[PDB]
Paper text:
To gain mechanistic insights into the molecular process behind these interactions, we attempted to observe the dynamic interactions of an anti-GM1 monoclonal autoantibody, GB2. Our study visualized antigen-dependent assembly of the GB2 antibodies on model membranes, giving rise to hexameric ring structures, which particularly interacted with C1q.
The bacterial IgG-binding proteins, protein A and protein G, have been reported to inhibit C1q binding to IgG antibodies. Our HS-AFM data showed that GB2 scarcely formed the hexameric ring structure in the presence of the B domain of protein A, which is known to bind the Fc region of IgG antibodies. We solved the crystal structures of the Fc fragment of GB2 and that of the same IgG isotype in the absence or presence of the B domain of protein A, respectively. These data indicate that the antigen-dependent hexameric ring formation of IgG is mediated by Fc–Fc interactions, which is disrupted by competitive binding with protein A. Intriguingly, the mouse anti-GM1 IgG2b(κ) antibody GB2, in which positions 345, 430, and 440 are occupied by alanine, glutamic acid, and threonine, respectively, were highly preorganized into the hexameric ring on the antigenic membrane formation without artificial mutations.
Author numbering:
A (entry chain B): 242 to 262, 279 to 288, 307 to 319, 335 to 444
B (entry chain D): 6 to 57
C (entry chain A): 237 to 443
The structure:
């Protein structure tokens, strides 16, 4: 039994779903849940386990200097000090979605929070041609559940 | 997209709304996000009304 | 019934010659009533007898855990010899075999870069030094931190994550006081991998 995807819960315009592979009241629609029934802690068995709930810092790191002589570079989005571990990082250039990224697992930091690293690979031509790259974080600690920090080349 | 998100985020943290009011505010929000502006104000004022 | 878990040597023991790699077999849920367990080891189905095996009390569920570590030579791990541990008990009708071996195959050296703290973070009490190690195969790597010759132990790093080209990347994050980032002259990221000359490459940064 599994939770739903955290980007599905922290955005009202998507659908969170609990997967077997509601507070003891039957529902006949499986194949999907209300975002609020999960956040207030109802039992589905599984729940949204709350604990400390800290909000992340979100910084974009540019390609390291030594990598700019190459045919490809790497943008870094470091997100730091959040709880729970569940988070969602994704990337855009202005408004169109960039998807050649990979990200690590949430890692327990020393203060019992979590950090996570996300890495957008692109051709070096793309890094000096495209005007903006924006890293898009969705944690429950953030206002509107959303946060968008943007970097530009210089 | 963006308006109907701040909607959802505030409606969910309005502390005097009850379960069913919050429940129906969302529903009546993800079904026609046009009135995201008015649905906030509506829930907003119904909160102050129900403060202790 | 008991179960056996096998575990490959410490990538640091493999990439330094003075140190000694070990393969380990752990036996869990050995009944307190029959803690005797016999373990034979087979480097390529050749029985070996240098295995050091200890018997331990697991005070949590009142069971026995047996740990057998067989030390090995670099060449037998690096060549991909297949180390095996057979484990027989009373509570085992016929015994249980585990096998482990290095994954001989493609190998690629890493590139190693130090990323200075993000510009937005220079203003807090603490900063973050990033080491980005990219492009290496196989996924077993070792990243440590030093500032001059003094080893720094407040690092945390990610799992090797499989990149797009089939390589592994990794990030190691040195947190430090923001006074340290401005006081100290040089911070070094230190990578060990089986693809580097002398199994070791050092990259160093200044403010
Ligand atoms: C009774 O209690 C004990 C102890 O309880 C435990 O500890 C206490 C303190 C509590 O915290 C409690 O909650 C804990 O449960 C129970 O003992 C455990 O039993 C587990 C099985 O029932 C066993 O399972 C996993 O073992 C591997 C992980 O173990 C390493 O990491 C642990 C985490 O820190 C650590 O405890 C271990 O000591 C071990 O550490 C490593 O040991 C090396 C040797 O000394 C050492 O070199 C290394 O440095 C060290 N590193 C670290 C970081 O510790 C898992 O890998 C393993 O996974 C395999 O099995 C499951 C299901 O079978 C799969 O999901 C996995 O994917 C994997 O299957 C293998 O899959 C690969 C591919 O993925 C295949 O290629 C393989 O063929 C598969 N099989 C094998 C054999 O490889 C297990 O999930 C725990 O390790 C064990 N811990 C201890 C300490 O004994 C005990 O069960 C209890 N009895 C009950 C409940 O009845």
């Amino acid at each position: 039994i599994f939770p739903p995807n955290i980007k599905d819960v922290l955005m009202i315009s998507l659908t969170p779903k609990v997967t077997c592979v509601v507070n003891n009241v039957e529902v006949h629609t499986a194949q999907p849940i209300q975002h609020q029934d999960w956040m207030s802690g109802k039992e589905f068995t599984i729940s949204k386990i709350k604990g400390l709930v800290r909000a992340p810092q979100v910084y974009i790191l540019p390609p390291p200097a030594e990598q700019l002589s190459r045919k490809d570079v790497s943008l870094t989005c470091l997100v730091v000090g959040f709880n729970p571990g569940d988070i969602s990082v994704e990337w855009t250039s202005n408004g169109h979605t960039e998807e050649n990224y990979k990200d690590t697992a949430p890692v327990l930091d020393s203060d019992g929070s979590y950090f996570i690293y996300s890495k957008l690979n692109m051709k070096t031509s793309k890094w000096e041609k495209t005007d903006s790259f924006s890293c898009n974080v969705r944690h429950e600690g953030l206002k509107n559940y959303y946060l968008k920090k943007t970097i530009s080349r210089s | 997209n963006k308006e109907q998100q701040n909607a959802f985020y505030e409606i969910l943290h309005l502390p005097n709304l009850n379960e069913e009011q919050r429940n129906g505010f969302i529903q009546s929000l993800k079904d026609d996000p046009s009135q995201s502006a008015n649905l906030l104000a509506e829930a907003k004022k119904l909160n102050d009304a129900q403060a202790p």
